Structures are given as structure tokens and as C-alpha cells.
Amino acid sequence: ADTIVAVELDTYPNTDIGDPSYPHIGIDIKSVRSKKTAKWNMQNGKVGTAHIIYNSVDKRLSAVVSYPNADSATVSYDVDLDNVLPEWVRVGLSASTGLYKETNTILSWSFTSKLKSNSTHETNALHFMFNQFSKDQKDLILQGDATTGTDGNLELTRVSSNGSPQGSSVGRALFYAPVHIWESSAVVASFEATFTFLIKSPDSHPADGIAFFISNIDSSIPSGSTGRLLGLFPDAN
Ligand SMILES: [Mn+2]
Ligand SMILES: [Mn+2]
Ligand code: NA
């Protein structure tokens, strides 16, 4: 199976599998059952922003999710990614809907990773910024129901011609180039990702969520990972 590290913006409380009884953000280390969560006052229909950071000095994965003029939600977890992920990975965004649904629209996505050599102290870096997603965005690997082009946005999950979200959908978008997330011979390493999203739902409750994730380069959507699995895991273990 794939190896996954992710920050989930979980819009639906699946308490049967460990979710807290409220929308929340969480840090997922090789399991959909978050190692740490924070309550999230998600706002149906408003554009929000997510900020994720990590560095090899503190080895603490943190995320901040908020909406303009509202109190933000923050979650942090100490984890040595060297012991979790392979040296080379791909980064991406994933989202899903299930019995309940929502739009999982990405309006922007940026990422920066840096690795400073212990032998020369010089740095290798990668940075990309997407403010517009075109119909044929070749530097992105779209999987499942993910599409680009409509209004210049990235729709991770299925949406009808009118804009209404569809249920039991799952989709992901990964940056084309592999990323060197960690290296034993690196004195200092870090990464940060930010994305703006618009989650809107006509249902009694929205579901299921969006996530920023890091995985083995050849990662693919696990069969059946719609709904509460967020297109990241094969099961809820
Ligand atoms: Mn959930
Ligand atoms: Mn959750
Ligand atoms: Na945009």
C-alpha cells in the first residue's frame, strides 16, 4: 500500500472511526485516524485558506486553517518524517464526497521545499504556485474525478454542469515533479504548502473533506476510498 502523511480538513464527523464529534482539521500519519485534531468551524460556501509547515530542526508538522475575519484552527504534531516517508515523494491535494457531498474546489495551491547540504551548505529548492488551473495543466497529475479548467479552478471531486456537487466522488491532483522531502546528509530541511478552497454543500451536512498529502511517488487513489477515507487510505485502520 501507499505511504501517506496528510493534513485533513475533515468536514464530516465519522465518530465510528475515531473522528471527533465536529468538523475538524487533523494530522494523519499513515492512518485516517488522525494522531492529532483541532475543532474546525468550517463555513459552508466561504473561501478559506490552509497553511501547512514543517522543518527538520523542530520536526513538528503544523497546519493553520481559517476564513477571513474568523478565528483560525491550528493543529500540530511532533513527527520525524525521516522515519515515515521515503526520501523522494510527490505532494498533492485530495478530496472526496460520500453519502453526503460538497464541492471541493481549489482556487490556489503553492508549495516550497528546501534541503540544505551538510557537506557544502548549499541549497536545493522547489517552488510552485498555482493561482489558475487550465483545462490542460500538464504539470499536474489528476487522478479519479479531479478536473481543471472550469473558472480556472481545480475541482477535486465531481461537479455537474451547473456547479452542484455529486456524491461518492474522489479525486486528487499531484505535482508532476518528485520532491526530495528529506535527506540524512541535510543540515536543514523544510517545506510549506498553502491552498485556498471553497467547500459548499446543498445537503443537510457537507462531506467529506479535503487534504494536502505527501506520498510515495507512484501513489494512486485507493479503491473504495470515497467518503470518510478522503481518497488517501484503503481502510479506516
Ligand atoms: Mn470524517
Ligand atoms: Mn477526521
Ligand atoms: Na484562483
Swiss-Prot record:
GO annotation terms (biological process): defense response; regulation of defense response to virus
Binding site for Ca(2+): D10, Y12, N14, D19, D208
Keyword Magnesium set for record: no
Other remarks on this protein: Binds one manganese (or another transition metal) ion and one calcium ion. The metal ions are essential for the saccharide-binding and cell-agglutinating activities.
Quaternary structure and interacting proteins, as annotated: Homotetramer.
Transmembrane segments: none
PTM info: The mature chain consists of residues 164-281 followed by 30-148. To form a mature chain the precursor undergoes further post-translational modification after removal of the signal sequence; cleavage after Asn at positions 148, 163, and 281 is followed by transposition and ligation (By formation of a new peptide bond) of residues 164-281 and 30-148. This maturation (circular permutation) relies on the legumain AEP1 activity and leads to an increased stability of conA after heat stress and at various pH.
The family this protein is said to belong to: Belongs to the leguminous lectin family.
Binding site for Mn(2+): E8, D10, D19, H24
Function text: D-mannose specific lectin. Displays antiviral activity and therefore may contribute to defense against infections.
Domain of life: Eukaryota
Protein's name according to its UniProt entry: Concanavalin-A
GO molecular function per UniProt: D-mannose binding; metal ion binding
Keywords on record: Antiviral protein, Calcium, Glycoprotein, Lectin, Manganese, Mannose-binding, Metal-binding, Plant defense, Signal
